Ligand binder design. Structure first.
Ligand code: HEC
Ligand code: SF4
Lengths: 79, 59
C-alpha cells in the first residue's frame, strides 16, 4: 500500500489502481486481493504467469525488485 | 515517422519495450525519450492504445 505514489510510471496503462489495463488488448485483472496479485506479479518475472503484453510487468517486478510490489499493488484489495 | 502528434505520456514506459531504443527507457513522466522518431516500427502502433490522446500517428 503506497500505490499511486510510485505508480507514476504506470498511469498510462492503468489509471491509478489497476483500473484499466491498456497496452492495447491486455487483461484488467482487478477485483483482486493483494496476495494473489503479488503471486501473479512475481509469476510474470519467473515465467510462471504471463499476460498478452506482460513484459513491461516483468520489467516493473524486476526494477521494483520483485518486494516493492507489496508497496505498489498490494493495495488493490478494494477491488 | 513516429508522429507523436503532440507528445504526452502519463508514464507508461510501454513503447520502449516494443521499439527497444527507438523509444529509449527514459520516460519523463510526460515525455518518453523517443530517440529515433523516424522509425515506423509497427510495435509502436500498438502503443497508440496507451497514449492518452492516442497521439502516435505513423507516416
Ligand atoms: C504499461 C506498459 C505498464 C506498466 C509500466 C505497468 N503495467 Fe501493470 N499491467 C500492464 C498490462 C499490459 C497488464 C495486463 C497483462 C497483459 O499483459 O495482458 C498489467 C497488469 C497489471 C495488474 C493485474 C494483476 C496481475 O496480472 O498481476 C496489476 C495489479 C498491475 N499491472 C500493476 C502495475 C503496477 C503496480 C505498476 C506500476 C509500477 C504497473 N502495473 C506497471 C501494463 C503496465
Ligand atoms: S505508450 Fe504513449 S503515453 Fe505511453 S510512454 Fe509511450 S509515447 Fe508515452
Amino acid at each position: 500500500a503506497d500505490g499511486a505514489a510510485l505508480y507514476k510510471s504506470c498511469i498510462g496503462c492503468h489509471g491509478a489502481d489497476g483500473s484499466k489495463a491498456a497496452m492495447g488488448s491486455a487483461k484488467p485483472v482487478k477485483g483482486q486481493g493483494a496476495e494473489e496479485l503479488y503471486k501473479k506479479m512475481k509469476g510474470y518475472a519467473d515465467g510462471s504467469y504471463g499476460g498478452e503484453r506482460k513484459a513491461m510487468m516483468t520489467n516493473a517486478v524486476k526494477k521494483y525488485s520483485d518486494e516493492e510490489l507489496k508497496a505498489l499493488a498490494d493495495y488493490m484489495s478494494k477491488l | 515517422t513516429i508522429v507523436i502528434d503532440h507528445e504526452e505520456c502519463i508514464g507508461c514506459e510501454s513503447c520502449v519495450e516494443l521499439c527497444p531504443e527507438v523509444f529509449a527507457m527514459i520516460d519523463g513522466e510526460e515525455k518518453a525519450m523517443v530517440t529515433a522518431p523516424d522509425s515506423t516500427a509497427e510495435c509502436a502502433q500498438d502503443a497508440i492504445d496507451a497514449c492518452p490522446v492516442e497521439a502516435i500517428s505513423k507516416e
